[PDB]
Amino acid sequence: SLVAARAEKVANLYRWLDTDNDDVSDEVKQRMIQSMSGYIEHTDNQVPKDQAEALATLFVESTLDYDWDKRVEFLTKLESYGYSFEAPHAEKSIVSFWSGKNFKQYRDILDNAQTDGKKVVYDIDVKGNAFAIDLNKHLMRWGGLFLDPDNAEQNQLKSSIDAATFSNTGFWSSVYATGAQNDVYVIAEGGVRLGNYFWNVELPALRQLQREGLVGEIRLLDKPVSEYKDLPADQIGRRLTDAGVAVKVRFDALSHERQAELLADNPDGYKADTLVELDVKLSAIDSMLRESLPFYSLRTERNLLVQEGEEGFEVRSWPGIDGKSKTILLDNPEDAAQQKSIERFILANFDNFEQMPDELFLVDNKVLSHHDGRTRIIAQKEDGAWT
Numbered sequence: 001s002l003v004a005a006r007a008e009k010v011a012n013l014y015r016w017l018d019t020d021n022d023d024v025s026d027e028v029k030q031r032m033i034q035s036m037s038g039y040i041e042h043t044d045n046q047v048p049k050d051q052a053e054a055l056a057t058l059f060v061e062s063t064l065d066y067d068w069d070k071r072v073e074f075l076t077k078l079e080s081y082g083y084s085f086e087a088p089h090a091e092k093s094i095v096s097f098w099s100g101k102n103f104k105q106y107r108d109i110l111d112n113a114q115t116d117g118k119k120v121v122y123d124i125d126v127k128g129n130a131f132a133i134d135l136n137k138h139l140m141r142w143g144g145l146f147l148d149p150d151n152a153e154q155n156q157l158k159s160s161i162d163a164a165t166f167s168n169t170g171f172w173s174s175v176y177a178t179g180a181q182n183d184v185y186v187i188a189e190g191g192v193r194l195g196n197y198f199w200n201v202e203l204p205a206l207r208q209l210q211r212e213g214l215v216g217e218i219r220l221l222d223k224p225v226s227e228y229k230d231l232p233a234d235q236i237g238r239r240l241t242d243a244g245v246a247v248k249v250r251f252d253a254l255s256h257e258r259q260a261e262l263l264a265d266n267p268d269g270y271k272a273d274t275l276v277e278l279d280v281k282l283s284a285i286d287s288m289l290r291e292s293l294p295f296y297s298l299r300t301e302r303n304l305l306v307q308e309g310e311e312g313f314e315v316r317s318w319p320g321i322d323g324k325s326k327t328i329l330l331d332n333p334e335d336a337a338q339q340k341s342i343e344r345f346i347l348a349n350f351d352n353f354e355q356m357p358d359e360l361f362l363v364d365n366k367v368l369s370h371h372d373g374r375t376r377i378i379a380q381k382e383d384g385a386w387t
Contacts, residue, residue, distance in 0.1 A: 100189025
């Protein structure tokens with residue numbers, strides 16, 4: 001179970017970043033689920049004839065519910081079938097946030113480009129990863145086939161199968177990339193744009209992952225394939241760490257005084273639809289990341305996992321021995337200064353998880369605690385006077 005450990009780490013980020021902007025029928029679901037059962041049960045693979053309808057219920061449940069526990073479940077349940085999403089050392093080449101025509105072409109370019117004697121590992125070259133994506137795509141196939149765009153909340157189901165399955169792929173690419181840690185080559189096709197999933201959720205994951213040492217030396221391929229062909233390795237990919245992120249906006253959505261400037265040079269080369277590339281500072285991405293993630297230091301230092309709870313928060317052990325739930329509650333759950341105290345406090349104090357209270361609590365510069373009975377252990381005074 002080498003996938004549960006890392007996969008747990010990455011799903012954590014996606015929970016935080018995705019969740020910032022993210023009824024269903026059961027009759028329709030069980031048809032979905034059942035073709036789900038049918039794909040695997042009656043296709044050639046290590047799908048138990050018993051637990052093959054147990055995967056097309058977990059898979060579809062995990063994806064569309066956006067249960068991140070059922071996502072690691074089905075990652076590691078696939079690891080319980082001889083599957084593997086750890087790459088064979090070498091150098092990884094994740095391209096999976098997008099899909100464009102010229103994806104094969106980048107590989108041909110890349111392998112000859114990396115003249116070592118060794119070729120570049122692919123995320124869809126992996127044993128288990130490659131199963132999962134095929135399962136994803138069947139939902140996708142199921143997606144645009146048994147749902148009609150002009151019969152009400154049936155297009156709403158499709159738009160949600162596309163939005164889950166995209167969450168899935170980007171998740172798997174990150175956990176794959178977390179494996180080996182040998183530097184990645186994300187290949188964005190049209191060019192990283194802004195306002196989409198990849199940008200708000202997926203890109204922060206990679207750099208937030210990378211910072212934590214998990215992955216390293218990410219290079220982004222946005223310029224057309226022609227641009228790369230054969231030159232020194234440095235002209236291959238825009239390194240994340242150099243400068244900022246080379247995104248593409250449209251003239252339309254650009255400034256009013258910056259359209260004028262743009263038409264001073266090359267005065268009728270720009271139209272409404274025309275796409276203009278402008279570097280996003282890499283300083284800005286980092287900063288929204290360390291504010292997109294509560295108890296940001298607890299994650300790094302004390303090998304804990306914090307996540308939003310029904311009313312408070314939920315700290316757990318990083319390698320999940322068990323699905324226990326030492327919580328952390330606050331009088332203002334939304335005050336950052338309160339949070340910072342509780343973090344600073346349980347940081348300067350507890351060294352590990354199992355050394356934690358059932359449930360901690362911060363009320364008006366006072367600290368509660370659980371054990372077996374509420375024990376108030378701090379002081380609103382300049383230095384916290386324990387007990």
